[PDB]
């Protein structure tokens, strides 16, 4: 046999978007949350 | 309702046929049967594919 | 195959089919195993090509019926079943061939002579069987 | 396990395992009468070896 | 039951087919197919006890032999003979027949 | 046919000279057995085993 | 003070059903595949 014919590593691109979605899903709208970021300086 | 459509999609999956292609062909034939007052049954043919 | 230890159970499938050739016709065991092994190699390219194994099985069934119909047109000669010492030399020669070299000329007259002794005189009669598998015994001496 | 599955046929009656073996038995018998016989047709011996 | 070697030559002159080593459960269904009742004593045997059967022919095989009671007017029974070359071919065919 | 050679030759030779033939009963029976042999292997997509 | 929200749990019970479904998925229908099963016999 040879080649691949499976691209399934593509699911990582969708999975990487699922993590960003869950972060920005909570703060959407007037009922959302106020996020805080700290650099350390 | 969506769980009952896996059986016709499974028969065409083992043969390598597109389960979405054979699904749209059956729905197109059922639309013409609803207009007429007759009764005609539609089924999936695995040999020909239609 | 009976003296070898089989690990993978898929190997026993070809072993069971090989024993069928020895029990009934008794000849061609090497033709069955080698041909069955090559059908898997040509089918391996179809798997990588994307062709499903379902249509591959259906393709062999259509090709098998076409081959059996052509076997009747490929017949050259017809054995008269004369059971003559010289006539049996044509069937026995290829059997001894491809096994042991140099003994095909000597063993041709020894085997063909023992067959004509156990067979009676008859023609065009297939109702009553005559030749059995135990009629020929092989002994050895130093 | 002897004959191939392609040569199978339907059996209207009943088939048995161990039949009688004699060289002079006829090949085909048409319109034969079946009679159940419970008595022993073979010689019998005492319970103790003799 | 068994057959003595003395009666082998007697049944050959009259062409009487003899059998031995019969299953007890199979003989219970022979009364339905053939119609004849089991006769325990020949002294009480009646001419109406004899049943009716069709062509009976035995296949010739070295290991075993078969008897065909088939071709009956009112057999009221059937037998499905399963043949196969290998062992798995017999298990697959038996599953397909029982499912049908 | 196919010649084994072993000494020397040019091209191939006629098989009818040595009278090497194959019976139909042997060749026809070997086709049906070899066909069903490879059919079983290609039809099995999964194998379950257990240690003894 | 110990009280929970009763997390969904579940999971693998459905995941194990998907693995068993794929075993009988290709085994259904006239065009399906025939699988060999030999355990200890």
DSSP letters spanning chain F: -----SS--SS---GGGTT----HHHHHHHHHHHHHHHHHHHH---EE----
Residues 6 or more apart whose Cβ sits within 8 Å of residue C17: C32, C33, C36, E85, E86, F33, F34, F36, F37
Q: Do G36 and F49 touch (CB under 8 A)?
A: no
Residue of E nearest to C15 (CA): E86
> Is-contact D5 E32, C-beta < 8 A?
no
Residues C43, C48, C54: CA angle, nearest 5 degrees? 55
> Is-contact E40 D38, C-beta < 8 A?
yes
> Is-contact C1 C15, C-beta < 8 A?
yes
Residue D17's nearest CA partner among A41, C44, E67 is: E67
Strands G36-37 and F47-48: parallel
User: How far off is chain C from E43, nearest CA to CA, in Å?
Assistant: 40
CB neighbour class for E92 (10 Å; exposed up to 12, middle 13-18, buried from 19): middle
Torsion-angle region of residue C57: left (phi > 0), alpha (psi -120 to 50) or beta? alpha
Dist CA G29 CA G22 (whole Å):
14
Residue of E nearest to C19 (CA): E86
Dist CA E89 CA E95 (whole Å):
10
DSSP conformation class of E71: -
Q: Does E85 touch chain F (CB under 8 A)?
A: yes
C64 contacts in chain F (CB < 8 Å): 31-32, 35
Dist CA B16 CA E38 (whole Å):
61
Alpha carbon distances (Å) from C79 to C69, C73, C119, G26: 20, 16, 16, 49
Resolution for this experimental structure (Å): 4.6
Dist CA E60 CA E67 (whole Å):
10
List the subunits that have 3+ CB pairs under 8 angstroms with C.
A, B, E, F, G
B3 contacts in chain G (CB < 8 Å): none
Phi, psi of D37 (to 5 degrees): -125, 115
Q: Does F26 touch chain G (CB under 8 A)?
A: no
Which stretch of DSSP H or E encloses residue E3?
none
Torsion-angle region of residue E96: left (phi > 0), alpha (psi -120 to 50) or beta? alpha
Q: Does F25 touch chain E (CB under 8 A)?
A: no
> Is-contact C22 C29, C-beta < 8 A?
yes
Helix residue ranges per DSSP H, A1-41: 11-25
D7, D8, D34: residue with CB nearest E51: D34
Dist CA E92 CA F14 (whole Å):
47
> Is-contact E30 E72, C-beta < 8 A?
no
Please provide the size of chain G in residues. Answer: 41
CA dihedral C31, C33, C38, C43 (to 10 degrees): 130
Dist CA A34 CA A17 (whole Å):
21
Alpha carbon distances (Å) from E24 to B44, E30, G18: 51, 10, 50
Q: Do G32 and B13 touch (CB under 8 A)?
A: no
Q: Does G38 touch chain F (CB under 8 A)?
A: yes
| DSSP 3-state of E57 | strand
Residue of C nearest to A1 (CA): C48
User: How many CB atoms are located within 10 Å of the residue G24 CB?
Assistant: 11
Which stretch of DSSP H or E encloses residue C48?
helix C29-49
Dist CA F16 CA C141 (whole Å):
36
Token readout for C65 is 């019926």
G31, G33, G36: residue with CB nearest C9: G36
Phi, psi of E80 (to 5 degrees): -105, 110
Q: Do C50 and B16 touch (CB under 8 A)?
A: yes
Dist CA F17 CA C75 (whole Å):
17
> Is-contact C37 F36, C-beta < 8 A?
no
Neighbouring C-alpha atoms within 13 Å toward the C-beta of G29: 20
Residue E65's nearest CA partner among D38, D22, C78 is: D22
Residues 6 or more apart whose Cβ sits within 8 Å of residue C2: none
Token readout for E91 is 């298990």
> Is-contact E68 D19, C-beta < 8 A?
no
Q: Do D33 and E87 touch (CB under 8 A)?
A: no
Q: Do chains B and C touch (3 or more CB pairs under 8 A)?
A: yes
Q: Does E87 touch chain C (CB under 8 A)?
A: yes
DSSP conformation class of D34: P
Q: Does C16 touch chain E (CB under 8 A)?
A: yes
């Amino acid at each position: 046999a040879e080649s691949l014919r499976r691209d399934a590593a593509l699911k990582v691109n969708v999975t990487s978007a699922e993590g960003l979605q869950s972060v920005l899903e909570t703060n959407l709208g007037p009922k959302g949350t106020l996020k805080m970021l700290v650099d350390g300086a | 309702a969506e769980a009952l459509l896996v059986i016709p999609k499974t028969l065409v999956k083992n043969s390598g046929f597109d389960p979405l292609d054979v699904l749209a062909m059956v729905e197109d034939e059922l639309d013409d049967a609803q207009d007429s007052d007759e009764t005609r049954y539609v089924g999936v043919d695995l040999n020909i594919g239609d | 195959l009976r003296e070898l230890d089989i690990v993978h159970p898929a190997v026993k499938v070809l072993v069971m089919a090989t024993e069928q050739q020895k029990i009934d016709m008794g000849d061609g065991t090497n033709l069955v195993m080698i041909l069955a092994g090559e059908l898997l190699n040509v089918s391996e390219k179809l798997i990588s090509m994307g062709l499903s194994a379902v249509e591959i099985i259906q393709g062999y069934n259509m090709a098998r019926k076409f081959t059996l119909k052509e076997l009747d047109e490929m017949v050259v000669g017809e054995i008269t079943d004369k059971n003559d010492k010289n006539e049996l030399l044509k069937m026995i020669k290829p059997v001894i061939s491809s096994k042991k070299y140099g003994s095909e000329d000597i063993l041709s007259e020894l085997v063909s002579e023992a067959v004509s002794h156990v067979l009676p005189v008859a023609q065009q009669a297939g109702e009553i069987p005559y030749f059995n598998v135990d009629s020929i015994r092989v002994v050895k001496i130093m | 396990q002897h004959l191939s599955p392609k040569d199978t046929t339907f059996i209207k009656g009943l088939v048995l395992d161990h039949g009688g073996r004699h060289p002079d038995m006829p090949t085909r018998v048409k319109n034969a009468y079946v009679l159940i016989l419970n008595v022993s047709l073979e010689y019998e011996k005492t319970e103790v070896n003799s | 039951k068994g057959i003595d070697p003395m009666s082998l030559d007697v049944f050959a002159k009259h062409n009487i087919l003899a059998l031995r080593r019969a299953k007890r459960r199979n003989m219970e269904r022979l009364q339905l197919v053939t119609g004849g009742e089991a006769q325990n004593s020949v002294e009480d045997l009646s001419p109406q006890i004899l049943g009716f059967s069709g062509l009976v022919y035995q296949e010739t095989i070295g290991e075993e032999k078969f008897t065909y009671v088939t071709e009956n007017t009112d057999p009221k029974s059937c037998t499905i003979l399963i043949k196969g070359s290998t062992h798995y071919a017999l298990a697959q065919t038996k599953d397909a027949v029982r499912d049908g | 046919g196919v010649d084994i050679d072993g000494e020397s030759d040019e091209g191939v030779k006629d098989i009818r000279e040595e009278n090497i033939y194959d019976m139909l009963a042997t060749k026809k029976f070997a086709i049906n057995v070899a066909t069903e042999a490879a059919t079983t292997v290609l039809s099995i997509d999964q194998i379950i085993m257990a240690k003894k």
